[PDB]
Design an enzyme around this catalytic site. Structure first.
Site, short mmCIF file in Angstrom:
data_model
loop_
_atom_site.label_atom_id
_atom_site.label_comp_id
_atom_site.label_asym_id
_atom_site.label_seq_id
_atom_site.Cartn_x
_atom_site.Cartn_y
_atom_site.Cartn_z
N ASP A 200 -11.55 -0.49 0.92
CA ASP A 200 -11.83 0.89 1.37
C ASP A 200 -13.06 1.50 0.69
OD1 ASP A 200 -9.69 1.17 3.18
OD2 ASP A 200 -8.36 1.98 1.66
N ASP B 234 0.85 -1.19 0.00
CA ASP B 234 0.00 0.00 0.00
C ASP B 234 0.88 1.23 0.00
OD1 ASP B 234 -2.51 -1.71 0.59
OD2 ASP B 234 -1.16 -2.13 2.27
N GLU C 242 0.27 -0.59 -5.03
CA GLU C 242 -0.99 0.12 -4.85
C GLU C 242 -0.57 1.53 -5.18
OE1 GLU C 242 -2.00 2.63 -1.84
OE2 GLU C 242 -2.85 3.21 -3.75
C1 LIG Z 1 -5.23 2.44 10.42
C2 LIG Z 1 -6.08 2.99 9.30
O1 LIG Z 1 -6.59 1.84 8.51
C3 LIG Z 1 -7.36 2.23 7.36
O2 LIG Z 1 -6.47 3.00 6.59
C4 LIG Z 1 -5.65 2.34 5.59
C5 LIG Z 1 -6.47 1.89 4.34
O3 LIG Z 1 -7.47 0.96 4.71
C6 LIG Z 1 -5.51 1.21 3.33
O4 LIG Z 1 -6.19 0.73 2.18
C7 LIG Z 1 -4.40 2.22 2.93
O5 LIG Z 1 -4.98 3.28 2.18
C8 LIG Z 1 -4.18 4.44 1.76
C9 LIG Z 1 -3.37 4.11 0.51
O6 LIG Z 1 -2.45 3.07 0.80
C10 LIG Z 1 -2.60 5.35 0.05
O7 LIG Z 1 -1.84 5.08 -1.12
C11 LIG Z 1 -3.60 6.49 -0.23
O8 LIG Z 1 -4.45 6.11 -1.28
O9 LIG Z 1 -4.40 6.76 0.98
C12 LIG Z 1 -5.15 5.58 1.45
C13 LIG Z 1 -5.95 5.94 2.72
O10 LIG Z 1 -6.49 7.25 2.63
O11 LIG Z 1 -3.76 2.71 4.11
C14 LIG Z 1 -4.65 3.35 5.09
C15 LIG Z 1 -3.76 3.82 6.26
O12 LIG Z 1 -3.11 5.01 5.90
C16 LIG Z 1 -8.58 3.06 7.78
O13 LIG Z 1 -9.32 3.47 6.64
C17 LIG Z 1 -8.13 4.29 8.61
O14 LIG Z 1 -9.29 5.01 9.03
C18 LIG Z 1 -7.32 3.82 9.83
N1 LIG Z 1 -6.87 5.01 10.59
C19 LIG Z 1 -6.85 4.97 12.08
C20 LIG Z 1 -5.54 5.62 12.53
C21 LIG Z 1 -5.43 6.92 13.01
C22 LIG Z 1 -4.09 7.42 13.55
O15 LIG Z 1 -4.18 7.64 14.97
C23 LIG Z 1 -6.66 7.85 13.12
O16 LIG Z 1 -6.49 9.14 12.55
C24 LIG Z 1 -7.96 7.25 12.46
O17 LIG Z 1 -9.08 7.93 12.99
C25 LIG Z 1 -8.09 5.72 12.66
O18 LIG Z 1 -9.27 5.22 12.05
#
Ligand SMILES: C[C@H]1O[C@H](O[C@H]2[C@H](O)[C@@H](O)[C@@H](O[C@H]3[C@H](O)[C@@H](O)[C@@H](O)O[C@@H]3CO)O[C@@H]2CO)[C@H](O)[C@@H](O)[C@@H]1N[C@H]1C=C(CO)[C@@H](O)[C@H](O)[C@H]1O
Ligand SMILES: C[C@H]1O[C@H](O[C@H]2[C@H](O)[C@@H](O)[C@@H](O[C@H]3[C@H](O)[C@@H](O)[C@@H](O)O[C@@H]3CO)O[C@@H]2CO)[C@H](O)[C@@H](O)[C@@H]1N[C@H]1C=C(CO)[C@@H](O)[C@H](O)[C@H]1O
EC number: 2.4.1.25
Length: 500
Positions: free
Chosen positions: A395, A293, A340
């Site tokens: 996602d 990713d 990705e």
């Molecule tokens: C921990 C995090 O998990 C989820 O985020 C991940 C996505 O599910 C993945 O598919 C991947 O997406 C990213 C792509 O790799 C990147 O190339 C770009 O397209 O952006 C994408 C995401 O916008 O990686 C993501 C992690 O960066 C989930 O959706 C996300 O909400 C979760 N975040 C938690 C972590 C923190 C840090 O304390 C908080 O800000 C959030 O509220 C949490 O939910």
């Protein structure tokens, strides 16, 4: 990398049907591989398989090496008498992570107690042998989890300083005081890898390749960051000084502050990229291909000072992707990586990908919100076909869910575009299939689809909704939900598009 024309399905193992609250590495996983083979599928893609914390996201793991104890099938253990399982009332169709956390950890702990009491010499030997072979990452992971449990779940960089800073004397005392807790976590790992290894052999016997998933950046609160502060930009107290994310753009004037610690790339290069080589070696024991990713981060990444609460204050910093991948090629003889690269459009990223023959991705749900130049539309895919097309990923909403909320424009353009490709539909529920068919007709060597689209499920089955507080990563298949008819339909589509 030469990918024959084929198709696969995306299904995280937690989504498998079966008793005890969560999909596990057992018979139902084998049933799914069988279903996939009968459907003519040749790839099974999963999300990261590491142990998870609050929020349950696979992308924020306590370790870049450990396996998720929730995926352990408890039945083989109950069968040897190591533990008595009692369903506390797990729901159908979804993982109740609160209940799984409250019930499965004690069931694994009881199983370990039963194991120490009844295990045969061969099992004791095998487990001991496993602890030795994997010590290079297991010692830190098991002590990390034991310490976490002894300090009320606190993140490693909030633990007492001697432990946080890994003073040898303090670590030795802790390892001694927590000996059984350390062995217990090591036991969850031995079970996880034994079961995954068996499942991998089953996949291979069925002609199936598994695509694993590894985020480019690891999590702040993880064993390897705690154990290798030298590889990350942290201050003396273990706090990241800069964090990962992406800059604001037309979509968000705030950008995304992910929070992940960032690599000291100069240090990694000086060490022959050892962390990455190790990371890939371990992953290649589990998977045939690894999707990484945010692959673009190997070329340049958005570096945000950790003090900034948003992503507005960063700057793009070049990373030594070329040298790293040259090293990966040298060591593994090939780069079994799927990039990705969603929404990158940057030339240098494309070039790095191409240099090593790495396929990128295309997501059809994003192809209809503008014009014919939209890179996600099939006619725009590269003639070499080194790309993986998806209807939607974990996602995204399921395609039926996406369709129900798509703009009048998207809905109309999709229908017209589909018609241009000889595809039509009548009811809403058929849209996921029409889009899967469009992906299969495309030049993309691999078409990989979420099982929810095969089942034409609505928004209730969406895996993850970025930004939403709850309900993520919980969807589960019901027993027998994927019917032979679903498989035959995929198979006929694959046959017609020459993906068998
Ligand atoms: C921990 C995090 O998990 C989820 O985020 C991940 C996505 O599910 C993945 O598919 C991947 O997406 C990213 C792509 O790799 C990147 O190339 C770009 O397209 O952006 C994408 C995401 O916008 O990686 C993501 C992690 O960066 C989930 O959706 C996300 O909400 C979760 N975040 C938690 C972590 C923190 C840090 O304390 C908080 O800000 C959030 O509220 C949490 O939910
Ligand atoms: C119900 C809840 O279950 C799961 O929660 C457990 C976490 O996985 C554990 O790691 C542990 O979290 C503690 C942290 O380790 C510690 O550092 C500190 O931050 O305190 C945390 C709380 O004790 O214990 C959690 C259970 O207490 C699961 O991961 C989590 O997502 C589940 N929460 C869901 C339920 C509700 C209720 O409406 C919502 O608030 C959440 O958004 C849901 O995700």
């Amino acid at each position: 990398m030469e990918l024959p024309r084929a198709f696969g399905l995306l299904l995280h193992p937690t989504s498998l049907p079966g008793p005890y609250g969560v999909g596990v590495l057992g018979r139902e996983a084998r049933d799914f591989l069988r279903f996939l083979k009968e459907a003519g599928g040749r790839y099974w893609q999963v999300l990261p398989l590491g142990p998870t914390g609050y929020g349950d996201s696979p992308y924020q793991s306590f370790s870049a090496f450990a396996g998720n104890p929730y995926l352990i099938d408890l039945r083989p253990l109950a069968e040897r008498g190591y533990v008595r399982l009692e369903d506390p009332g797990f729901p159908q169709g979804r993982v109740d992570y609160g209940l799984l956390y409250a019930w499965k950890w004690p069931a694994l702990k009881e199983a370990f107690r039963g194991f120490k009491e009844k295990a045969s010499p061969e099992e004791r030997e095998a487990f001991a042998a496993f602890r030795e072979r994997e010590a290079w990452w297991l010692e830190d992971y098991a002590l990390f989890m034991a310490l976490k449990g002894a300090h009320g779940g606190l993140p490693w960089n909030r633990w007492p300083l001697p432990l946080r800073k890994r003073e040898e004397k303090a670590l030795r005392e802790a390892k001694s005081a927590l000996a059984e807790e350390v062995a217990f976590h090591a036991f969850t790992q031995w079970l996880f890898f034994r079961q995954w290894g068996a499942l991998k052999a089953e996949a291979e016997a069925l002609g199936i390749r598994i695509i694993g998933d590894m985020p480019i950046f690891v999590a702040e609160d993880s064993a390897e960051v705690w154990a290798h502060p030298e590889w990350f930009h942290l201050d003396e107290e273990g706090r990241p000084t800069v964090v990962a994310g992406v800059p604001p753009d037309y979509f968000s004037e705030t950008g995304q502050r992910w929070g992940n610690p960032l690599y000291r790339w100069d240090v990694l290069e000086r060490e022959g990229f050892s962390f990455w080589i190790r990371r890939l070696e371990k992953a290649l024991e589990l998977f045939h291909l690894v999707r990484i990713d945010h692959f673009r981060g190997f070329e340049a990444y958005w570096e945000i000072p950790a003090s900034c609460p948003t992503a507005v204050e960063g700057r793009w910093v070049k990373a030594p992707g070329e040298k790293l991948f040259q090293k990966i090629q040298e060591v593994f003889g090939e780069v079994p990586v799927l990039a990705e690269d969603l929404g990158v459009i940057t030339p240098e990223v494309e070039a790095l990908r191409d240099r090593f023959g790495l396929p990128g991705m295309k997501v059809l749900q994003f192809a209809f919100d503008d014009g014919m130049e939209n890179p996600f539309l099939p006619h725009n895919y590269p003639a070499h076909g080194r790309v993986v097309v998806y209807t939607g990923t974990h996602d995204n909403d399921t395609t039926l869910g996406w369709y129900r909320t798509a703009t009048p424009h998207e809905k109309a353009f999709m229908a017209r575009y589909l018609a241009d490709w000889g595809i039509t539909f009548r009811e809403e529920e058929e849209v996921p299939w029409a889009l899967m068919h469009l992906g299969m007709k495309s030049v993309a060597r691999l078409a990989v689809y979420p099982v929810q689209d095969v089942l034409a499920l609505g928004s209730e089955a969406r895996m993850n909704y970025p930004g939403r507080p709850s309900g993520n990563w919980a969807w589960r298949l019901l027993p027998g939900e994927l019917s032979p008819e679903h498989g035959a339909r995929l198979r006929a589509m694959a046959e017609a598009t020459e993906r068998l």
